[PDB]
Amino acid sequence: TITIKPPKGNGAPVPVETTLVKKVNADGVLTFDILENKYTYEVINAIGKRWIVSHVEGENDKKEYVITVIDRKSEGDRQLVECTAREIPIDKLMIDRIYVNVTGSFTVERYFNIVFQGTGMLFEVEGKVKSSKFENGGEGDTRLEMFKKGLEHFGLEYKITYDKKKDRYKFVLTPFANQKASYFISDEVNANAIKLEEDASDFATFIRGYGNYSGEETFEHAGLVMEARSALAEIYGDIHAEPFKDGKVTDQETMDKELQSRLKKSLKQSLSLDFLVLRESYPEADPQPGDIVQIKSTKLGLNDLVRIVQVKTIRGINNVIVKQDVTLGEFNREQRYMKKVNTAANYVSGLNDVNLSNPSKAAENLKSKVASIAKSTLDLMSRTDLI
Amino acid sequence: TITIKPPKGNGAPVPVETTLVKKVNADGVLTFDILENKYTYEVINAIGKRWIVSHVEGENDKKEYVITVIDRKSEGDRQLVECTAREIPIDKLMIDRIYVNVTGSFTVERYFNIVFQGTGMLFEVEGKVKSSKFENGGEGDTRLEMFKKGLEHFGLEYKITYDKKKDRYKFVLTPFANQKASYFISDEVNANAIKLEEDASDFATFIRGYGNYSGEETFEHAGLVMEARSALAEIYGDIHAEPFKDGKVTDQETMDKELQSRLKKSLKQSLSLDFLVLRESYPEADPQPGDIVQIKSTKLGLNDLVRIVQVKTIRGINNVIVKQDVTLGEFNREQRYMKKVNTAANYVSGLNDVNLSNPSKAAENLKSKVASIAKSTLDLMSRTDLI
Amino acid sequence: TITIKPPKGNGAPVPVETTLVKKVNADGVLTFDILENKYTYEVINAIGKRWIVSHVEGENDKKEYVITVIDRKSEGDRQLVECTAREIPIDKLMIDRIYVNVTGSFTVERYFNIVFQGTGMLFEVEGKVKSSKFENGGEGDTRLEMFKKGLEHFGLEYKITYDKKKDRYKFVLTPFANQKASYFISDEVNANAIKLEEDASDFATFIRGYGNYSGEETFEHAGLVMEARSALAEIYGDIHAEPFKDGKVTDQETMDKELQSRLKKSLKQSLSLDFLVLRESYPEADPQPGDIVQIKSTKLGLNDLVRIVQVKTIRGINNVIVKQDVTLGEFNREQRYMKKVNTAANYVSGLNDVNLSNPSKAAENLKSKVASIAKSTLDLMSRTDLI
Amino acid sequence: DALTSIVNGRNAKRNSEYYL
Amino acid sequence: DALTSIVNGRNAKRNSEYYL
Amino acid sequence: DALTSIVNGRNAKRNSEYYL
DSSP, rough: OOEEEESSSSSSEEEEEEEEEEESSSSSSEEEEEOOOOHHHHHHHOOOOSSSETTTSSOOOOOOOEEEEEEEEEEEEEEEEEEEEEEEHHHHHHEEEOOOOEEEEEOOHHHHSSSSSOOOOOEEESSSSEEEEESSSTTEEHHHHHEEEEEETTTEEEEEEOSSSSSEEEEEESSSSSOOOOOOOOOTTTBBEEEEEOOOSSSSSSEEEESSOOOTTTSSSOOOOOEETTTTTTHHOBBBOOBBBBOOOOOOOHHHHHHHHHHHTTEEEEEEOOOOOHHHHHHOOOOOSEEEEEOOBTTBBBBEEEEEEEEEEEOOTOOOEEEEEEEEEESOSHHHHHHHHHHHHHHHTTOOOSSSSSHHHHHHHHHHHHHHHHHHHHHHHHHHOOO | EEEEEEESSSSSSEOOOEEEEEESSSOEEEEEEEEEOOOSHHHHHHHHOOOOEEEETTSSSOOOEEEEEEEEEETTTTTEEEEEEEEEHHHHHOOOOOOSSOEEOHHHHHHHHSSSSSSOOEEEEEOOOOEESSSSSSTEHHHHHHHHHHHTTTTTEEEEEOOOOTTTOEEESSOOOOOOOOOOTTTTTTSSSEEEEEEOOSOOOOEEEEOOOOOOTTTSOOSEEEEEEOOHHHEEEEEEEEBOOOOOOOHHHHHHHHHHHHHHHEEEEEEOOOOOOOSOOOOOOOSSOOOOOEOOOOOBBBOEEEEEEEEEEOSSTTTEEEEEEEEEEESSSHHHHHHHHHHHHHHTTTOSSOOOTTHHHHHHHHHHHHHHHHHHHHHHHHHHHHO | OEEEEOSSSSOEOOOOOOOEEEEESSSSEEEEEEOOOOOHHHHTOOOOOSSSEEEETSSOOOOEEEEEEEEEEEEEEEEEEEEEEHEEEHHHHOOOOOOOOOEEOOHHHHHHHSSSSOOOOOOESOOOOOOOOEOOOOOTTEEEHHHHHHHHHHEEEEEOOOOSTTTTTTTEEEOOOOOSSSSOOTTTBBSSSEEEEEEOOOOOOOOEOOOOOTTTTOOOOOOEEEEEOOOTTHHHHHHHOSOOOOOOOOOOOHHHHHHHHHHHHHHHHEEEEEEEESSSSSSOOOOOOOOEEEEEEETTTTTOOEEEEEEEEEEOOOEEEEEEEEEEEESSSSHHHHHHHHHHHHHTOOOOOOSSSSOOOOOHHHHHHHHHHHHHHHHHHHHHHHH | OOOOEEEEEEEHHSSSSSSO | OOOOHHHHHHHHHTTSSOOO | OOOOOHHHHHHHHHTTSSSO
């Protein structure tokens, strides 16, 4: 069912229920639970991590993943192995770092070519995309998170694919990655439980933006002062979000696009419905992330079309699906909170200045040092202007 | 029951069970769950967010709130709408920002008048209150959080009220906001479950404080070196909290008040009891936050009087109460933890320097730059003193 | 059973079920739940915090702890007291701070002697240990967290002991604190549920390190550029962790030890098994943290020996044990996450610069100020080199 | 396994209107 | 709905004595 | 008391592959 091989050489299949999860740009991940048996013994007693799993979904979808977590429990006179795994087109990026500090202006192809140095994978952009400047390179950082920053600046979304060729993974970078899908949904036919959530606690009608003042000014608001607003503003009225304070961008064409993007990203709609697969009927609905879909729930006020952003497959044996879960538009309110928490908890404990007993000594020492050197610089300025 | 109106014009009532929550200074919030019906159809299929809810508690308590969250679930051949809402005397503050960076000395009336510019609401202080200086204004910030900072400096508590007049909300700022209440409690009569929690893990008997040294010194402890202690110290003995290191305050009258406040805030007592309303008897006990109350639990060692700090009402239909929950003194141990977590998780992800793969590059780059410019400044100092 | 005394004078016993927890270096803690009775009344109605608990484990293990949390619940016509408590050889450290900012080079005995000033406790190192330099002292900090930093630099582990003498607590500092234990384990005999967890998401085969470049350089990679790797690398291959960027260490002997320590700390194995005490048989297995033990689970592929890192005792009455829980090697995956979260949530809310509405003003103001003073310093440099 | 989601969901609900 | 509070309460308990 | 562990365990599971 699931062909797993060491990092050197031959394969071996095992039957086990799988739980895969795929997002548009975020890392995909799977999980499963092997158990000891008369079969599987030679494997289960001999798996070391970074075992290479593949041939999920049968004799197709040869998307090769790698295990990183390994649990081993004892049940009766046998033993379980829960385990986790991640993509090679993502892990292979988490392999390598870059030490040369990228800095300055950077066109997109140059940037996403220097980071694909030695990995072997390939990138390509579809539409014309502008260029910007990256302040400090991640000398002690992965290729992955610099890929994150690059997507945040230039290519707002992406999609990988195992091309026909061996050891190749084309990264189609694109804003708002999508493909049409023939299938569809409705409350009656494929949508058991439709949770429509409309979160708006950080939302906006008009908004201000400042983005060409030099690095040393910070508020003497030169640099394309403007405020924009969306169409819905006129009935809701005067509100506004955190203005686009940070910016070294010259033109005004940018200052409206980024600004309206700051607006329309905030009136959030997460549809964490549930999907239930029909095999004997409607088989042509294998959900895949980053596709278009036309949902329609009667008695809800809903017929529009949306895009998948999260999908969650399970597959017991023979790669037959049991159920699916999906989320549309924004991935969740939930997962946004959880990522916020985990980012806080990992950014912290990666630092070293933290001292829980009276913190801010490390920050206040720094800030007072800064103001003191500024005072000394003032003295130097006066003393030099004297001469 | 609950009169809700769009942001433009006419009202419409609906019956629905409500869950309100009110704290002293913190934002109040409510929640409720409408459902589809033969009634309510014209509304439920036509609510957009920032719908204006009011006439809670019947033909009285016309405290107009606004919805910001909207869930829509499908139950049977009908649909639910869970939803949340917040005060207009708080949301109307979250509307507007201030871009002019408040900076320097500031008397309280001036400060809480510049922030009530265009909002229409009104503020007033009761007792005489000193003045201090605010270092950096929140140019990209709400009026609300600057109101928070102002309360943290000058007016340690507040209380809003819908005065008789239309579109007016008097903010009585006061330290330790309280009003006498005729009602009372006891274990026998109104207090089902008394959880008395006495948390002391960050507590103090004596304490040091430094607060007039200039901005560029940071430890050459000029500026009113002193250590104070409370009355209970003499039996517990030598402990001390984080000293009042940060301070630009001249006088010594302050340095004892703030210091003893740092002390007595820490031997914490949270009484998260439960309240159960008697309607046929004892009706004159509508609990309201920021009031005095005289509890008394026999077989506990308790007859003192306290103040409410949190209250949690529910009201099914006809605005009849079912139960109440309350917390006294400090709002909880629980909620303090949860606010700590959420502040961490939202302060993080609001930043942009964070890189989970090897963090501290963004901080160490900065710090090393700082020490390097200090070295260059040392060179300049020597080279100028030469001439 | 449990002899508790006020901070001044006489003792009083109570029977109550206890829950103790002991880690190697981390603070131990206990918890228990007294209840009102015909007995215990004089005590329970008269406990104030920092009551001094002792004589756990009977007429032995006179390890005196102190209560800091006090809950008081009402059950029927009686009342419960849940409560928590901590070691005096740790709390007595959390008592006192140090205000003189330790700074510069520091030999280990000097450092761990200046911090044991007035506490009365004693420290000693067993093996020869090198010395390093501490950048900023914790003027507003506990003796405890400076003890933490000291252990992080020089003495990578420790172990306290109540020596025979009164008011003495020897701190045997040691790397990898261990003592042999005659007892042992196996799946059949003492190990009910063996959860073996092998976490590797932040792991390494080779790794780079930079640690002698001066404070003002930050990447012009002078200072012992090197990359090392472990033995298992050759089959897993090219990966690497966050390189040892931060360092002011001269020699190369260090740069391999610390580097391989960064490696081997990451292929993590947490064995959060469960232990079940046999009293009538096998009594000589009182588990104690920081000991060696030889586990062996058949049908698992396991006979190696490990060390305890966490233990969790309970004792109902007469100090008879009911069950034990333990964790081996690294304390958990779980607790690592939880400590990460709580460190984030407490480091935050200890600060004052945080403003949830548009954060980064406090950081960007600072950074732009820094670059501006650097620009002014550039101007000064040019203007001085002119003269 | 089923349970983490309900608590985290209520937590994210509580993240609305917790702050002055 | 009822459940978030018990877990968060035990969590805040655990926040006592977690740190060296 | 029994419950905190299951949620925190699933949380630590979720800490694997949450980040680009």
